[PDB]
Design a protein around this ligand. Sequence first.
Ligand code: GTP
Ligand code: GDP
Ligand code: GDP
Ligand code: MG
Lengths: 48, 71, 439, 430, 430, 100
Amino acid sequence: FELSKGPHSHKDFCSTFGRVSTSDFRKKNTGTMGSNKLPIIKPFKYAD
Amino acid sequence: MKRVKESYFREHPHWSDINGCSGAKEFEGEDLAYDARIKYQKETQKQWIEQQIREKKMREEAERNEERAYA
Amino acid sequence: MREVISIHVGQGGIQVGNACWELFCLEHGIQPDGQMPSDKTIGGGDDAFNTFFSETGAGKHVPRAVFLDLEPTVIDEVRTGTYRQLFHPEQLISGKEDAANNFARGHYTIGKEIVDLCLDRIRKLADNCTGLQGFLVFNSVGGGTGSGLGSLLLERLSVDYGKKSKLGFTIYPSPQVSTAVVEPYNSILSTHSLLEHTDVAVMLDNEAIYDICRRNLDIERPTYTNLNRLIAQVISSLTASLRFDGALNVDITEFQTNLVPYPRIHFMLSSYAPIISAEKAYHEQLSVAEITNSAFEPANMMAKCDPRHGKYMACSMMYRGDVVPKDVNASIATIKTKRTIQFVDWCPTGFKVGINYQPPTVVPGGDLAKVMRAVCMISNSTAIAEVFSRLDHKFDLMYAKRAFVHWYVGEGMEEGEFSEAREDLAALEKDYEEVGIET
Amino acid sequence: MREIVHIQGGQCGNQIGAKFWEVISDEHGIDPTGTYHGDSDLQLERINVYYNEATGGRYVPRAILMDLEPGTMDSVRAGPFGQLFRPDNFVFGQTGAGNNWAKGHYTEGAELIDSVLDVVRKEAEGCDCLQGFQITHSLGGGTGSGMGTLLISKVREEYPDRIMETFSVVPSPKVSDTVVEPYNATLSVHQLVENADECMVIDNEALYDICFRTLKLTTPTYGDLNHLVSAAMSGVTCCLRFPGQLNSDLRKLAVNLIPFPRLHFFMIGFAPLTSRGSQQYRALTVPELTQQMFDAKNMMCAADPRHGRYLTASALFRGRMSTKEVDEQMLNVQNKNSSYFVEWIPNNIKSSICDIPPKGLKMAVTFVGNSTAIQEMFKRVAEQFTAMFRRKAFLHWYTGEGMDEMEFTEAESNMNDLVSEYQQYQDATA
Amino acid sequence: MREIVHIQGGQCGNQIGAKFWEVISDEHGIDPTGTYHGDSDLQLERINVYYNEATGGRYVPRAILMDLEPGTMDSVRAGPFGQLFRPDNFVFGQTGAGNNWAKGHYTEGAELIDSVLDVVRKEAEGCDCLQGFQITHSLGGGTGSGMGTLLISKVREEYPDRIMETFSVVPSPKVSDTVVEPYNATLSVHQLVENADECMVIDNEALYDICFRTLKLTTPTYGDLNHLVSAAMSGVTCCLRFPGQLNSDLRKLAVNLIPFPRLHFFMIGFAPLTSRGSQQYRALTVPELTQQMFDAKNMMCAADPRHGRYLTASALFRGRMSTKEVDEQMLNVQNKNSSYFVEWIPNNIKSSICDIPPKGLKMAVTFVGNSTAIQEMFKRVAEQFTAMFRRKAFLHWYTGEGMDEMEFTEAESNMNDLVSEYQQYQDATA
Amino acid sequence: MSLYGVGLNVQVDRIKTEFRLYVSKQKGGLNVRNLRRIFEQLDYQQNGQLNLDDFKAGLNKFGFFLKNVDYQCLLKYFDVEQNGNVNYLAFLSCISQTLN
Ligand SMILES: Nc1nc2c(ncn2[C@@H]2O[C@H](COP(=O)(O)OP(=O)(O)OP(=O)(O)O)[C@@H](O)[C@H]2O)c(=O)[nH]1
Ligand SMILES: Nc1nc2c(ncn2[C@@H]2O[C@H](COP(=O)(O)OP(=O)(O)O)[C@@H](O)[C@H]2O)c(=O)[nH]1
Ligand SMILES: Nc1nc2c(ncn2[C@@H]2O[C@H](COP(=O)(O)OP(=O)(O)O)[C@@H](O)[C@H]2O)c(=O)[nH]1
Ligand SMILES: [Mg+2]
């Protein structure tokens, strides 16, 4: 029912002809590839 | 609709064909043409492909030739 | 009325599919275009082709080969290779994107979009078959693509065919001759998957097969092409009993009911013999007596595990050629005498013996020297614990600093997956030592 | 299939384009006219990876050339293979750069970015299944860094999964190509680290160092230096294009080379290289091949590779070769130089095979690895950056186009922070 | 059957006329003398659409020319293809309007309705099964909007069941030709909303924007601007005159593009167009047709089609092509750009295919769309009007020939309301 | 593959071996003259030439099947007249030794 897409997907907001202040910027680690941290550990079951 | 053929392949046997039918000792259900019929069926259709595969090629060619002609 | 279906997932298998199937066709002489020039055969009538092929209605003979891959480069080569005329067009399935050596991508990213057809493809093939003997699954453990789909393939099989027995051949990473830098991770998980869903398995470590080449065939610069043929030869011997007439045939079914002490510990290793190039075939007697003993030599084993560090629980050997029944019995008799090979206390007889007449065929331009002797070896011993140990020994080391973890994190898999992988791997090895302790 | 598009910026960025498509054009056998006269189908099995299709069979580069000043762009047009690119892909401003990051990143480049984003968006959506980008821009230039980096920053935002390949040219202190280079360098890295995935730092010193101690040639132009790099680029992209033992694309390369999320600066080199007067006696075998690949002097980054500990590296052989003589060699190197490799990652060198060697040769190698020796570059840039800022000299310009002081302080801390982490792994032990 | 008759108004109306007939004559193969020399049966199959048969073999256009000053009807009949307009239908007074919306619509136009109204009725009486009317009139021209609207106001009074179409050339903001352009802009619009079934907006600012950037020709002319527009009108009704897959009569265009009664203004354009230097290096495939159709720079209007959302749009494919890609490609455009298309009108693109392509090419497409962006045009026209009215500037010219400034105030309320009403749904959600 | 240098020789170096090795393996009725005798059938005009479709067809009957790439090198070397035609006589003149 859901049809959950994975890596690429196909639904977008500003796909084809979208685009119509110096104060703003990235502060420390807003970047995706930085942030040498990992999420919390969850038990998980695997029982199925 | 009608029912003219006892079997889609074999027509009804000639009335002289059933000289007996006195007892259930002959049935004509044993084929005796089965193995032969299958093998012959192979080639009869295969030509059909042989005819068709060429046709699809030329149809494509006419499609391809024009493109350059436009080119 | 007997047929088999072989599943090859991942590049490693893909190069195996061409190798494995090429031997079979020549074995029958099935012509490359698929339309065998036809012959009266020399063994077991003319029905032998049924197992590996089905009548085409008119013309060729399509193998029951279904190929799945996430990359086009390796696969499509078959679509334009010398065997363009062999496989059916819509059964060599390839995707679009490459796994990039990540299991989570292989097990939680592109499954549904592509795993769906594999069941769809396989089901259609099965419906034609009537008395299916079983299935064979071939994949590379260290291959990023195969581990996910395969495990994805394996898990789904358990519900798809249930009682339908499943037999598999994997390729674990080499202890020191390695290829990738993250192979242990997906391997540990990959084995983690297949512990609970395969009746019988086999290990084919790369290095071990590497060594035999220099010692026996006397070749100094081999490439993956050389390796596959050996893998092909073993498979042919294993499946020989199905179609070729023999005094005591051994069907595939008699592997999940004869070679496993328990449903859990089913990882068994195979061997091969004799392996002598005709360069030196001018001297070796190539007799039954010597060949049988060579089956128990330590160096020739198909995996780099020393049998002398463990016992023998179950071993399956099926012969092919012009061996005499009397000689074989003598072959076993001597082996049990040797103290160097010691069996467990609760296993009185640890041998199911197979015999075959037809001599193995020769691949064109190959390195094998066709002989009148051949032994196919299948053994499940207590020695197989260590191979897991080394993989575990690696897996623990990297985890301490959580290396290369995020990229698996970003594919949807949770971090706790590892804990059960170590425990499930850990939960096993203790089992192997226990059964090996005499009562 | 899984094709990629290229965008280049700056004279160094542009110049490489003239050579870069030159070698790629010949590898598949493209002539100056662009018509296909290829001999074997092996040159067209995966041609779409770098070319589209149009009427008459003419094949057009997937090119996007952008700059602030037209003069450098004008030259690239008139040379050989200067007729492949189509005008629509071209863009050019009117005021120039002036090697000032401000005019390249906030005021001037802001107005023109609309066209490139539009032109970049035209190519991507058309392609079957976009696989990634390769950005070749210069950090030592104003328009280069300013327009360049900002181009990398914006793209990531709209695209979630696209992979990135970035080839940069860090300035070495000896060849002071721009006094304002130190400031620009720190600004570029700050933006880069947050969005760039893979970056290959090539020091111009090595190109000069390479030209003398490797090739042994008298008078090279920037074409040769442009020639040397171009081989490296094609070295990595080939495997995705041709048949091979173990196919491996760019992304497959990433998974094995970045141990942690933001330790992703790599080191590349080429081999085998030999001079006119010294290329007759040696024996051309991979065992001789590997020897020149690991040797530090040949590496194309001024950071000495023997002063650090290797973390991750990849090997991409070219041409035919058996598995043995490559794999066994690799195993040999790992054990015989234990002290030079980290201890908590075993079998930490990747290898792969490509079935089409470069035309005119028999064997070649392209190497990419993550080595801690790269820490030498940032600190030395790090030390230089602080020196000029303690006097505020040259700081006024960046403040003349809307910028402000705390940006520089933030950037300096991160780069000081980035160096901080990249060494804590060096002394780490299991 | 179901033919139409054309009424052109004003000098701008006449010149624009001088072309489409020429092009319309070209497609049917009608020589200047009126002697038929087409090649196939198709060109004569539907000749009734724009011509009636006259004894002698030469074909009479159903054209009615109206203008308050004789010059326009003078030059139109002097140049090429000027002799096809047959002298009976020419109607002209003696005065001229002088851009006075008052002069051309109450002072002189009101006096002339008699003859022109008589002639048009007869011509409509001639057709077998009437379809509608087309009009060319100049809003910024006093006479065009003046004489033009009254007839349009008059025409709807007697043909309640005939669809009405009006191509309009509203003055762009950047470059102006008349100072009284604001005033006459609103008055014509106010009367245009209340009577016209379909009015198309074309901004002269865009055309020159279209010519320089796409056609890349050095020296355009009003003939060229006429050339572009003249093609479009043939674009809307082309499929009607020829056999085809999905016949789409102009009325069917009304069905699928008018959401509510008062929003009856669309924006159109013609493509593809190639350059003097790009015609041989582009691509000719369906994706190119869709890629340029929605491109911002191609729409003949000054309003950018991205500042708002498309309420509905239609694409009329011309020529042969695989319908697969026609329908699928639209499904490509709709999905990736949902935010720019309102979310309560699923499947909001119309498609049609015609089997007769333009003379000299393989593929063709013409585009018609009603987009929220059009609010930009009326506001600036609306904003300008308020600027001049508060000071009663130039009020006397209109006050001294029968008018009261109350009507001017009345006009603003309707025009302002339409602008407000037109934008109400943009913030509306489901 | 890599057929820019000695490739033209090297690529044809293997193909002969496969044809030479393949025929010997089966060791049956394979008469090297069968190909020579078969070719005249497709010659039609007896000019000694055949277009690529025939030559691939000619190989199909005998029992020798090859890759797409391997054939491609075949045309280049044996297209002496640069007409894109393989001189089967030339081919048959080759793949035939001088005897021990
Ligand atoms: N036996 C054998 N194994 C191979 C061969 N080629 C590759 N492998 C194995 O494959 C493993 C790596 O996977 P790849 O072969 O590169 O490809 P894959 O298995 O399909 O995995 P992906 O990279 O995700 O596609 C290596 O560790 C090898 O052990 C081969 O020719 N023969
Ligand atoms: N190796 C090499 N470097 C180049 C080349 N062209 C420019 N550069 C580098 O670019 C730097 C100067 O940047 P600049 O030309 O101002 O970049 P731009 O402003 O973007 O055009 C110098 O430090 C050079 O090292 C080239 O052809 N080869
Ligand atoms: N693009 C274009 N616009 C025109 C043309 N002729 C007239 N116009 C427009 O019409 C306006 C002038 O209209 P005008 O001649 O006063 O109308 P009139 O009252 O009928 O004479 C100008 O602002 C132009 O924008 C033409 O041939 N091409
Ligand atoms: Mg792979």
